[PDB]
């Protein structure tokens, strides 16, 4: 079904994350963490405090695809377990979908906060307007390995 997914996304904010390599997205998928540049870290911390869900939608540059999406479970924090990224604070994230979506499937979605360009277009950290972001997340193939019960309880 899609009902719990729609519930998690209700009144959410959405941000495009552009990564330079699959290895870092793989690490994020395995460890449930993300780290970004200071300008985006500040924006995400602000969004985390005000919105009931903040959703990161990931895309590896030149892949032509999104690799999935996740919900922030914390603000950024320093001093924790180190992460062997491929070269700020660390956000904890809960994955909602670890399956890919090709850009060809989102060609009908425009992002008002980026001049109504197709939603695949955007710098790392670009905010995606609510309706566009909701519809983008609903386009991903269902990830039947995920149980959103525990995510709902964190809201
Ligand atoms: O956001 C990126 C970045 C690039 C340069 C300086 C700080 C942060 C990368 C780093 C690991 C995962 N995300
Ligand atoms: O998407 C809409 C928009 C965005 C930018 C210019 C005109 C119209 C509005 C914005 C808030 C709610 N929806």
Closest Cα to atom 11, ligand 2: which residue? 129
Q: Is 81 annotated as a binding residue?
A: no
Total Cβ atoms within 10 A of residue 2: 9
Q: Known binder of ligand: residue 147?
A: no
CA–CA gap between residue 47 and residue 42 (Å, rounded): 9
- Indicate the top mutation candidate among 109, 126, 129 to test ligand 2's pocket, ranked by most ligand atoms within 8 A of CB: 129
* Ligand 1 center–CA 117 separation, angstroms: 25
Q: What ligand is nearest to the CA atom of residue 19? A: 1
- Measured from the alpha carbon of residue 56, the closest ligand is 1
18 labeled part of a ligand binding site:
yes
The pair of three-digit structure tokens given for residue 67, joined into one six-digit string: 């690799």
Residue 154 Cα, ligand 1 centroid: separation in angstroms? 26
Alpha helices (runs of H) in 22-81, residue ranges in sequence order: 22-31, 38-50
CB distance 39 to 82 below 8 Å = no
Residue 90 has phi, psi (to 5 degrees) of: -110, 125
Radius of gyration of the chain measured on its C-alpha atoms: 14
Resolution (A): 1.1
Q: How was this structure determined?
A: X-ray
Question: Could you tell me whether strands 110-111 and 127-128 are parallel, antiparallel, or unpaired per DSSP bridges?
Answer: unpaired
Residues with C-beta less than 6 Å from any ligand 1 atom: 24, 35-37, 85, 88
Distances from the Cα of 116 to the Cαs of 45, 61, 88, 110, 121, in angstroms?
Answer: 25, 20, 30, 5, 10
Domain 1-155 = CATH 3.10.590.10? yes
């Amino acid at each position: 079904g899609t009902s719990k997914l729609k519930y998690v996304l209700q009144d959410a904010r959405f941000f495009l994350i552009k990564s330079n390599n699959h290895e870092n997205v793989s690490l994020a998928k395995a460890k449930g963490v993300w780290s970004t540049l200071p300008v985006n870290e500040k924006k995400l911390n602000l969004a985390f405090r005000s919105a009931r869900s903040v959703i990161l939608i990931f895309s590896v540059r030149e892949s032509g695809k999104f690799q999935g999406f996740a919900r922030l479970s914390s603000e950024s924090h320093h001093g924790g377990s180190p992460i062997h990224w491929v070269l700020g604070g660390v956000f904890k994230i809960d994955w909602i979908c670890r399956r890919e979506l090709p850009f060809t499937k989102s060609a009908h979605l425009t992002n008002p906060w980026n001049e109504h360009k197709p939603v695949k277009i955007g710098r790392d950290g670009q905010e995606i307007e609510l309706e566009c972001g909701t519809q983008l997340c609903l386009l991903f193939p269902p990830d039947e390995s995920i149980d959103l019960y525990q995510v709902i309880h964190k809201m």
